Design a binder for this molecule. Structure first.
Ligand SMILES: [Mg+2]
Lengths: 267, 231, 185, 258, 35, 231, 258, 35
């Protein structure tokens, strides 16, 4: 029934309100051939990275409005340790390989009692720059603590605040009004998603394959998927219930292919 | 020798959508293969069928759900005309693919979800009226139309499939025209019995609305899109 | 000048960038406190905002119903966007040059506000437009909301003497704006 | 019917599911991706070269650089600026005459239906003149090549190096047009409509693909540099996506409510 | 086949007209499979 | 009678590389036969595979070899980026055929030759680093990359074949672009053990470098060449 | 791997020879000789004749010879001077007005890839005008013939003898071009890109082939000599090597290091 | 076959189009054979 234990390596996770594993775009997103843009032998999966990586995520209060998202880039959260999410021996291999080609398998846990209401929209959103400030630089761990939840403003709906290049003193700087890495917040359900309602489930299960513009992408500079927890209905409860339920997530890379070995990445 | 031809009146005309090829310039280019990419959109009706959120003006900060008050009133809790130019359909994938076309045909599928607490029990009447001279507001005026009663329980979604009742085989997807009480009629969510909540549960739960396309929703005649998303 | 000014104006060139999103409730309090203090009909004032489009939110007017209608609009302005402070100055430069063609030796005063300081490609034009507005005959004051380089506003204002923090700003501009009112006609 | 939308998959029903009804007959296949992008539309109005150009130097371009702007058309539906690919699209609202107004472009008909992430297609380029009786020529260089910017003196006439080459310079007849289909020549397997990675280039910026383009055309007039005219002549570049494939569904742009 | 009414005769060959991929070695399927 | 044609928009266009013939003018010319000439170049990749000399700036008088000093230092004896626009590749047949093209694909093959005396014994480490943020200089930073140790003995040549490690299937043959620490990385010749020479032998022998193409080096997309060889 | 480069033959290895790797797939055949020279490129900008010419007399030409220079285009990738084949290529750096500036030519796109010694091909000659609305004509005479230089009076109009002949004089329509493919007509079996022998001619000079050419074209205007215009009109000669064969590998030119 | 996409139809004959040699009576081979 609704009791699915997903054993992987030396780390298994249970759930007793499982809606089902939302496999994305294919029947089995684990099946994946090697990259065709390498003339060396890839470092395939091995039993020390074939496991789940639980890391926390900011609490979900009543102060959060509608559509306030919270983006967790993959593999970009392994590398900056976003939400206490130490990558283990996966990040110890991701820093030492130039190209990496994996498909993810995430699971977001948030335990609501039957007297709470609310609905997170968890989705694996491909190719977005939501972790990056409208000023280029990526967000550090302090800036993820200084806001706790990114409000869906007009700059995110229009894509006005995606990072740009400085045109220099020569060109008159144009009035930027649009950029293609917007979020249309009403159409995030086109992505591989499940809704974490406060009355059906406590754990959503998304399983996505590797997508990307090249048959394998760079290891440091890829953001081909982005976990995206969006509030559709705000949390509401009466005074006495468990305030601020925590949100966690659990990321497992299915069938990686590491190509291009070198020493540990020094900027 | 010379084949005696006779070129037509449309000689040396550049027509933008000529169903035909043209001369290559820089051919014999083997492109790198895309056998690795999953999820190919063969047809853009694979995305109208994916249900996306609607946008209702609260009682540019709009809300995808309907807050359900505890006060009795014999008018629909939310009501919106079934027209894919209506602003509760601008940011669905149904109403934003179809606004880039000229005709449509088939069944809009309005999916609901009761995002309240698990301990809530209630019922909702869901009436689609065809175009009448007056929008039906009373529950007894909407009991007579195409309705269906949705009981809140364990499973928390209901997919009211709006029928395609129209004389013409393909309805116009954009009713920006000299307007009346708009065909194709009105959807309306009536609360039948009030939502009975146990003590220490939040008042006013939320019915999250979706809007997908049916298994027979078909589009026709591309038109030039509105470029006003960029200003 | 020893000759008194026939007119006297005031320009609230206000930032509505993404950086002032947590500080617009303090910038709006600063503007209303200077509008509802100087109620003289000699002084006209105009409300210019900028994030990406430099937009004149209220033209150079003096009708205190219109200015109240102007201040009821500034309370409901959503911050967000880049910081094009040069296009804040171009809307004032279209109004100084339009009011230098009346035969009235007026006096243009410009008040600037910024949290998020400008990139090199944007500071080059805002320093250029502030040089343009002084050549049109303005007095540029640069009021600073929270942490800001004075040197990035030393070029924009007249000097380092004309750059003020926002908490000291109404304390500064209480008599600084009032000093030219007695100088005027 | 009774369903669970938290599951993430809602099966597309019909009228017969809840009620008494019937299936409507399938109308047409105009939503087919290979059918719907296979039609021409305007991309960018570019000026026509009249001498050996200087290709726009990469950003941040400083003042004083004598270069030629608004002549090269980076053939891409993604937003460009100054003939180089960009992320944001910027239009000048009140373009005052301080600084060089950078020629931006975008494919307005594409993004309103670009409900996908990756898009690969051939490209039919038709270059319609916007000048009465213009005899122009349409040079081109692929994704990953650069413009050959000098002149060689033939018979005391500075004939530039963009008359010849190994890339197609189609010459137009007077009062005519230029139309030719370009193959997919970028090094990426597909073109990212939306890209989230970082291009490790001249200083790295998130969300900016490096080789998401079909090339760059430019229009020149087939006369040497001593026969230079005075007035500025424009040309308009239409574009058709032959044999389009699209992957990985995504969002459509936010239509506002004001 | 696309927006192509030329059912009869292709003058140029397939490699010159189109751009085929080099080798590495109706029914609208869903884009999400609940398993 | 007349076949009714419809000439296209590219009528009377002269395209320089049209993959097609044209009208003869002065035909039926039997040419004298060339059956006697040997060595026909069927393909210009029969000449990239022939190894030609490189050119290293000495410690327009450049030198095809690397003089090997007797002084210990933990930096590579010579190091040059694997980019076929680099000036240690202008006058090879690999880098001067490929600079007249736009893409390449495959394995550059760097052949060495120890042109010192026969009585010299030594070893050389030969590291190809992929593009890192910093060029590896220490022997321990270059031991970790793709290396191979070359022992000087009877046979006096070593063909270090540089792998084709790149994301894109065809690398750009000309990196004249806004530049960084250049892909595709760096070749580097480290002396591992010092060259031990018997008495009355010349100090500082010479490692003559070559640069050929592999058995899978493939070129694509001709471009107009640089005519600056003639000025 | 362990090899001997003193042997003179080094076998082209792969990654799998020394390391663990694999063969990359063969990309394309654009290095094929018959593919790579079979594309058009500019050869020489020549003036257009307006009367019966005087062909350039052979070297050393003394002063006072009233001849017509810069009208004949000796169709050869090798360096020419004054419509006759030469060895060295000379361009005037500061051309002061003492003496007649000799029209030199060279095929810049050929020698940068002429990594061979002997080269035989047919020749497609396209003669593009460099003048608005020029009705010209492209005469020709093979390798080893001479120009017929006089005029015959038809109807009191000095029609020259280069209007007729047994060699192709293609007439262009107004605003049009002339394109025709010339066969290999030289008496040598191949054309020497590099030649080391001596031509036993008018005084013998090493390194100068006598019949390494496809002929000589010249442009004239189809009017008699009484209808002579005043201004000088140019025409540009493009050239394509159809069905190219090449023998005996050799060097590529020295790219400098300054 | 060269840079020739006309796989279908040659109008002019082979002697007129090309220039064949008169009679006297893939695998890239190396240009130097060590023997
Ligand atoms: Mg700011």
């Amino acid at each position: 029934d609704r009791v699915t234990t997903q054993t992987a390596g030396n780390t298994a996770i249970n759930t007793q309100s499982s809606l089902g594993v939302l496999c994305a775009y294919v029947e089995d997103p684990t099946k994946s051939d090697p990259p065709s843009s390498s003339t060396d032998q890839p470092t395939t999966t091995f039993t020390a990275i074939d496991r789940w990586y639980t890391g926390r995520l900011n609490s979900w209060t009543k102060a959060v409005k509608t559509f306030s998202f919270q983006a967790v880039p993959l593999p970009g959260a392994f590398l900056s340790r976003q939400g206490g999410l130490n990558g283990g021996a996966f990040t110890a291999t991701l820093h030492r390989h130039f190209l990496m080609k994996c498909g993810w398998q995430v699971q977001v846990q948030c335990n609501l009692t039957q007297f709470h209401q609310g609905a997170l929209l968890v989705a694996m959103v491909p190719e977005t720059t939501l972790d990056v400030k409208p000023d280029g630089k990526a967000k550090s761990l302090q800036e993820l603590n200084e806001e706790q939840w990114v409000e869906m403003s007009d700059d995110y709906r229009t894509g006005k605040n995606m990072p740009f290049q400085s045109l220099g003193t020569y060109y008159r700087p144009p009035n930027w009004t649009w950029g293609p890495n917007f979020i249309n917040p009403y159409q995030v359900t086109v992505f591989p998603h499940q809704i974490l309602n406060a009355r059906t489930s406590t754990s959503v299960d998304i399983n996505v394959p590797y997508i990307g513009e090249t048959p394998t992408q760079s290891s440091e500079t890829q953001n081909s998927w982005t976990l995206l927890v969006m509030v559709l209905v705000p949390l509401d409860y009466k005074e006495g219930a468990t305030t601020d339920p925590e949100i966690t997530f659990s990321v497992r890379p299915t069938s990686p292919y590491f190509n291009g070995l070198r020493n540990r990445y020094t900027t | 020798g010379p084949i005696p031809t006779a070129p037509r009146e449309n000689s040396l005309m550049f027509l933008s959508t000529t169903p035909d090829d043209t001369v290559p310039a820089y051919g014999n280019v083997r492109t790198p293969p895309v056998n690795y990419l999953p999820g190919e959109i063969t047809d853009l009706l694979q995305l109208a069928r994916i249900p996306t959120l609607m946008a209702f003006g609260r009682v540019d900060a709009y809300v995808p759900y309907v807050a359900v008050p505890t006060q009795f009133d014999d008018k629909p809790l939310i009501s919106f005309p079934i027209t894919l130019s209506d602003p509760v359909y601008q940011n669905t994938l149904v109403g934003a693919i179809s606004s880039n076309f000229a005709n449509y045909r088939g069944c809009i599928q309005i999916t609901l979800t009761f995002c309240g607490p698990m301990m809530a029990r209630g019922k909702f009447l869901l009436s689609y009226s065809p175009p009448n001279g007056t929008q039906p507001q009373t529950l007894s005026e909407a009991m007579q139309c195409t309705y269906s009663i949705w009981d809140i329980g364990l499973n928390s979604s209901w997919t009211f499939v709006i029928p395609y009742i129209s004389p013409s085989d393909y309805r116009e997807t954009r009713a920006i025209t000299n307007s009346v009480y708009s065909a194709d009629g009105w959807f309306s969510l009536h609360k039948l019995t009030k939502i009975t909540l146990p003590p220490d549960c939040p008042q006013s739960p939320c019915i999250l609305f979706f809007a997908s396309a049916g298994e027979d929703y078909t589009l026709r005649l591309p038109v030039d899109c509105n470029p006003s998303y960029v200003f | 000048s020893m000759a008194c000014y026939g007119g006297f104006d005031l320009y609230f060139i206000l930032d509505k960038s993404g950086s002032v999103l947590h500080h617009w409730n303090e910038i709006y309090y600063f503007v209303e406190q200077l509008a509802h203090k100087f109620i003289s009909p000699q002084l006209r004032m105009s409300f210019i905002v900028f994030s990406t489009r430099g937009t004149t939110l209220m033209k150079l007017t003096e009708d205190r119903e219109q200015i109240r209608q102007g201040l009821e609009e500034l309370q409901k302005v959503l911050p967000g966007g880049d910081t094009y402070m040069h296009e804040g100055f171009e809307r004032a430069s279209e109004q100084i040059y339009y009011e230098n063609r009346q035969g009235y030796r007026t006096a243009s005063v410009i008040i600037a506000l910024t949290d998020g300081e400008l990139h090199e490609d944007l500071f080059f034009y805002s320093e250029r437009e502030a040089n343009r507005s002084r050549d049109l005959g303005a007095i540029v004051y640069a009021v600073g909301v929270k942490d800001f380089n004075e040197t990035q506003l030393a070029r924009i204002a007249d000097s380092k003497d004309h750059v003020f923090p926002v908490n000291d700003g109404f304390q500064a501009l209480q008599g600084i704006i009032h000093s030219i009112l007695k100088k005027s006609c | 019917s009774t369903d669970n939308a938290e599951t993430g998959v809602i099966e597309a029903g019909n009228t017969d599911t809840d009620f008494s009804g019937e299936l409507a007959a399938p109308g047409s296949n105009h939503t087919n991706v290979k059918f719907l992008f296979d039609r021409s539309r305007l991309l960018n109005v570019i000026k026509v070269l009249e001498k050996d150009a200087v290709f726009p130097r990469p950003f941040p371009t400083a003042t004083g650089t004598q270069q030629d702007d608004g002549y090269f058309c980076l053939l891409t539906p993604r937003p460009t600026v100054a003939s180089r690919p960009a992320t944001r699209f910027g239009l000048y609202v009140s373009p005052s005459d301080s600084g060089v107004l950078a020629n931006t472009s975008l494919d307005f008909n594409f993004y309103s239906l670009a409900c996908f992430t990756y898009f690969r297609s051939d490209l039919e380029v038709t270059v319609v003149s916007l000048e009465p009786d213009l005899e122009f020529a349409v040079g081109w260089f692929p994704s990953g090549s650069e413009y050959q910017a000098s002149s060689f003196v033939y018979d005391q006439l500075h004939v530039p190096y963009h008359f010849t080459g190994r890339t197609p310079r189609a010459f137009a007849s007077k009062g005519g047009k230029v139309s030719f289909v370009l193959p997919w020549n970028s090094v990426s397997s597909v073109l990212p409509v939306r890209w989230g990675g970082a291009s490790k280039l001249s200083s790295a910026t998130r969300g900016l693909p490096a080789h998401a383009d079909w090339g760059t055309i430019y229009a020149f007039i087939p006369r040497p540099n001593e026969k230079k005219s005075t007035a500025v002549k424009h040309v308009a570049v239409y574009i058709r996506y032959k044999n389009a494939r699209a992957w990985c569904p995504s969002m459509l742009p936010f239509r506002s409510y004001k | 086949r696309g927006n192509n009414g030329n059912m009869t005769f292709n003058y140029y060959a397939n490699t010159y007209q189109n751009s085929v991929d080099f080798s590495t070695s109706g029914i609208l399927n869903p884009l999400g499979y609940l398993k």
